[PDB]
Symmetry: D2
Subunit: 260 residues, 4 copies
Amino acid sequence: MLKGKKAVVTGSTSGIGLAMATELAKAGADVVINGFGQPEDIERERSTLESKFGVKAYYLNADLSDAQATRDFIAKAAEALGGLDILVNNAGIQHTAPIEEFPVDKWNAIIALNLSAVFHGTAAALPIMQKQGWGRIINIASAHGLVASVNKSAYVAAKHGVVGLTKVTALENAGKGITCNAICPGWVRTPLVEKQIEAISQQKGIDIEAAARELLAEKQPSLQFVTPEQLGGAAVFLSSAAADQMTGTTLSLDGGWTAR
Amino acid sequence: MLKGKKAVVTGSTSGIGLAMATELAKAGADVVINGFGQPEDIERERSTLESKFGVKAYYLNADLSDAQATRDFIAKAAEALGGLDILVNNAGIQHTAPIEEFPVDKWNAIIALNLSAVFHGTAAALPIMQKQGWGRIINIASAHGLVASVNKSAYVAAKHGVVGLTKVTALENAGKGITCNAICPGWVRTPLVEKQIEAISQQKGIDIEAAARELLAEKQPSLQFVTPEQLGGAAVFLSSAAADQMTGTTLSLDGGWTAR
Amino acid sequence: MLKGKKAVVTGSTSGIGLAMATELAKAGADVVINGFGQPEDIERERSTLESKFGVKAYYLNADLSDAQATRDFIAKAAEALGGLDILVNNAGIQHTAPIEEFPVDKWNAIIALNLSAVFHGTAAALPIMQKQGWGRIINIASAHGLVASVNKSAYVAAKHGVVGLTKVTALENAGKGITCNAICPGWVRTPLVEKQIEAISQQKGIDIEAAARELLAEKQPSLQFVTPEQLGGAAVFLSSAAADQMTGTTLSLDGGWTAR
Amino acid sequence: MLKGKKAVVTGSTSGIGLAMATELAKAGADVVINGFGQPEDIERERSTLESKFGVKAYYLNADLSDAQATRDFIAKAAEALGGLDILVNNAGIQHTAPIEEFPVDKWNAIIALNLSAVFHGTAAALPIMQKQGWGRIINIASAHGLVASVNKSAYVAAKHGVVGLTKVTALENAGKGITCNAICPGWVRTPLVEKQIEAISQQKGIDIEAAARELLAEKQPSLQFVTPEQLGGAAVFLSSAAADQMTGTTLSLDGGWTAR
Ligand SMILES: NC(=O)c1ccc[n+]([C@@H]2O[C@H](COP(=O)([O-])OP(=O)(O)OC[C@H]3O[C@@H](n4cnc5c(N)ncnc54)[C@H](O)[C@@H]3O)[C@@H](O)[C@H]2O)c1
Ligand SMILES: NC(=O)c1ccc[n+]([C@@H]2O[C@H](COP(=O)([O-])OP(=O)(O)OC[C@H]3O[C@@H](n4cnc5c(N)ncnc54)[C@H](O)[C@@H]3O)[C@@H](O)[C@H]2O)c1
Ligand SMILES: NC(=O)c1ccc[n+]([C@@H]2O[C@H](COP(=O)([O-])OP(=O)(O)OC[C@H]3O[C@@H](n4cnc5c(N)ncnc54)[C@H](O)[C@@H]3O)[C@@H](O)[C@H]2O)c1
Ligand SMILES: NC(=O)c1ccc[n+]([C@@H]2O[C@H](COP(=O)([O-])OP(=O)(O)OC[C@H]3O[C@@H](n4cnc5c(N)ncnc54)[C@H](O)[C@@H]3O)[C@@H](O)[C@H]2O)c1
Ligand code: NA
Ligand code: NA
């Protein structure tokens, strides 16, 4: 556990990121959360981290598709926490279309958030971690950082990029007490995936749960979703001493996706 | 933690395997240990698992280079434990030489133990795990299951084989409550590596600790050994609920080896 | 050979790209070249393709860091050639620095050219190839699309991205007569690498050829550079019938870099 | 082309190997063929290589599941040819079953032929190639050297092993003028695959060509078989000067299998 640690999770107002923040707070870390949503919902989440788990929590709104806003977000997060031990670069978006129809603005948006924000956030965090001789950078990539699917050019490119960037970060900081790894989930039933399930259901003329089964069966041999709580557990493991020499690698929780 | 669980670790009389057994016993599992060594040392280890950690422990001697002996070992282990929830296929040997000089008997020995024993042990364990709808198979591969080094033809071939076999096991048992993953360590300073350090030291005419540094610097960017305790921690993570959808993959704890 | 084929090579005014164009022209393709340099040198190269190899050649200046300029370049190339059978996405730049010092504008420039231009060029080319039921898209990635090195965050991220994008392109166009693959070279002694050799030489206080040897020895087991002509040969192979079912993959010509 | 070169192809009495031998003979190499079959068919193939392509051809019967027989085969091949420039390690077998039912003798047979014979053949060939400062070792692995499928434990393990062994061979001989690479095909409609198609057809109660379509659709995005002639073309490319710095890698011709 992580008592005393200071953690930042991007895109933690909902989905995987919120489960990350929750597991980190449970383990005893103070947490900065981030992302979009209804103000009342976000404040309920912030206050819940504090009242359930007895840690400090802060919400810092920053649109991480902007480089300077990301760099400023990290600075503000570190100021709030009084340090920065663990950075989870999680915020991301999706858009599906074939390449020749793929909107240029969607390409740019996905590269900006899913790839460039990881770079800018890392760049801002590293000097803090380097000065204290301890850090964890945990990038949320995807099975799509290792393999491809149709109609996901920007996302697959970005996630592959994140895997590469994770490696560079690790190598540059090897031996310094700082590790960087990429968690690579398969399907997790958040709203990012519910939209894809809904789209299949309309294409096929089937109920939503039949469509969820079809989505799993195509990619994920276990035929079960990965959960946000499982991913939170993986982040806590990466943050532990057992993972001191785990750096520059991918941790796939994907129900067998990448085994075939 | 793993209270009530029944674990078998091959090649757990010393080295990584003994640390695996220790962490599993600490987490509350009963443990079957296995491997060669001085009878008094092995019995001290068995009795220590019991008296420190309050679990049952059994030592079953089996030379796992023999298929039938491996299959019989699993049966005897399951009988002793009253079940079999977690199998860690760890036993292995090494021999370095270039291919054209590599002894045929050493090729055969390394394939037999480092690869075939994983198959035979898995084959024996699976029906037990399938009937109870829960299992963990944890194969100890290597960074050398993903990349190569000179003079390690048999070992690299075997370890790559283990990574492949891990994938097949995972896919065949997808959704059944059984996962199979391969831990892929970089250098860990056991006697298997001390022999290689000694060999460098003689080649270079340097003290042993200088030779250990040279061994690390060539391969392992962190310039630190991975520890057996870290690997034990990884095994405990793989055995946890957070890893229910982690299957068919590799968990590299290698100080950056495979990032470059 | 490629008589009658219509090829476009980005960044073919010098370096690898010019060797690509040359091999394609030798094989009988008409070629559009592209890139920066002295006008007289570029025109000499264009006219040389024609007079040596008896093909048509065109130079179209476009700064491919701009999306619309890339898309317009493809349209103009296809108009010049009367079609578009083979697209080699080669143009790229490099900049070395550690992450926390890595200029934001250099990150943006490298992502724009080395990754985004591949997307925009592919997007523009695909409908042409889809309508004729034959095409080759050949992306020039790197060993750094598969593994990392220090101080190359943007480039490694971009090149990993290219490998991902190559996979998506291949899958979206599977069976259509169009393949997409990524050539992943190790060191090739162009000006992009000569700058790095010069930088080592100054850091170490050694002559340039000693520095070239040091650059090779660190990464490239063969201790020899890959040549632009070899890479041109690989492109010609990818464009051949033997490669009709080679799609979505990487072709490493790297002197062993990625084997270890 | 390969005029004057001396090539050996294991398991070249039929299937992929015979197409390998044919392309090598077409390119001007003398060829030793090997494998089982009807004596009259094998002699017709040998004599055809000579009369169509004007090269010398030899058939040497050796059961390559035996180490010493493999090593002796290489010696006899080199004696027949007057040298040995190109070795294609192709012979292989398949057997499908789940792990817990997988015959021990089939595990042993597949490891012996598909993995160990590659080692023994390489070991025998290397000193010949080392003394002349030129060689090509071309191992026929599979998509199953990179990823898994159910019911193929031994084969996947073996093929992964071959990929590892290829890397070691390459690294040990880096810079010596000898390269070693693994061709990794997807489905090729030989008798090894026809048996699997027939098995699907009986399971599903469908005609053989429907079953062939189902076999492709599951794994191979292009929905077309790879041909033996394509693979022969890849071998000829690997043997060319363009591939002098291609070593230690995999060349996937798999219709997109490994892209997803
Ligand atoms: N759901 C899956 O199956 C899955 C699988 C693998 C990887 N991923 C990755 O996990 C991460 C989280 O995905 P999720 O499924 O929880 O998605 P989600 O849509 O449920 O949550 C996205 C989060 O990011 C925030 N966000 C969006 N745009 C932002 C911006 N410009 N700046 C700051 N925050 C922003 C949202 O407000 C939200 O908090 C993403 O990187 C995604 O690619 C998801
Ligand atoms: N040490 C490292 O750096 C390292 C790194 C990666 C992977 N590995 C792998 O970890 C595993 C353990 O290695 P280690 O370094 O602890 O080695 P070790 O030599 O210290 O221990 C080997 C264990 O296996 C047992 N053993 C040997 N032959 C056996 C046989 N025929 N049957 C049953 N048991 C047998 C030994 O008695 C001992 O208990 C091996 O598979 C090895 O390949 C080790
Ligand atoms: N040299 C190597 O060792 C090596 C190895 C692997 C991959 N690569 C890749 O090969 C490709 C070519 O590299 P190179 O070594 O020949 O480099 P180079 O610097 O010699 O040539 C780069 C080419 O791209 C052009 N170019 C640059 N910016 C451009 C822009 N904005 N728009 C259009 N054209 C532009 C240049 O004018 C030139 O024609 C790059 O993608 C590089 O990443 C090179
Ligand atoms: N067919 C495919 O889809 C496919 C795909 C990828 C890889 N492969 C690999 O390609 C290689 C050739 O396969 P194929 O499909 O042509 O099979 P095949 O069954 O058509 O041919 C096998 C060849 O090996 C010979 N052989 C068998 N046992 C032997 C032994 N003990 N000693 C010497 N020779 C022996 C046979 O006589 C025959 O010449 C194998 O390694 C296989 O794993 C095949
Ligand atoms: Na590597
Ligand atoms: Na895959």
